Design a protein around this ligand. Sequence first.
Ligand SMILES: [Fe+2]
Length: 186
Amino acid sequence: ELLKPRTLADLIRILHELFAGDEVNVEEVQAVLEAYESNPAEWALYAKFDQYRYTRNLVDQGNGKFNLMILCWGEGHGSSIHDHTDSHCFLKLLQGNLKETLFDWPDKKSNEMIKKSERTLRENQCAYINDSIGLHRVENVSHTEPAVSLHLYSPPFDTCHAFDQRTGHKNKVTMTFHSKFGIRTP
Ligand SMILES: [Fe+2]
C-alpha cells in the first residue's frame, strides 16, 4: 500500500518495505520517489559539493538489496556516457535540473555513439534507467544553478562502464563515495 513519503526518513522506511522481497516493482518505486517532495533541510547533510566534478553521497545502505545516495552537480558538471551494471537505477531531482541524454548500446564496430534522445529532468521528477533501456549521460548544463539528485540502485553496484562517445569503446570505472551517512570519506 503505497503512501506519500512525508520526509526523506519516511521515504527510506518505505523503500525498505518495497525491497523487502526478492523482486522490484519499478513503477511503484518510481511513484514513491516522485511523491517525496524535496525538502532541502532534510538532505543538506548529504549535499556535499566538489568544485570540479559531481559527488556521490551515500544516504542509506538498504537491506542487502539496494543503495540510496545523493549526487551533487556544480554548474557545468556532468557524467560520462555509462551503464548501470545490471541494476535498477532511479534518479529523482532534489534541486535544479539535469539534462539526460540516452544512447544505444554500441555495436562491436568502432563508431560514433549518436544520442537516441534527450530530456530535461526537473525538480522532484523521478527518472528510471536500466541496461535494457540503454546507456545515458547526465549533466547539469546550468551556468548559474547547482543540481542535487537522489539515486536508488538495486542491487547495489560499485563499478560501471564509461563509454567513449567517438568510438563506443568501454572502460570499467570503480565508483567511489564522496561521503557516507553525512561523513566525508576521502
Ligand atoms: Fe547513470
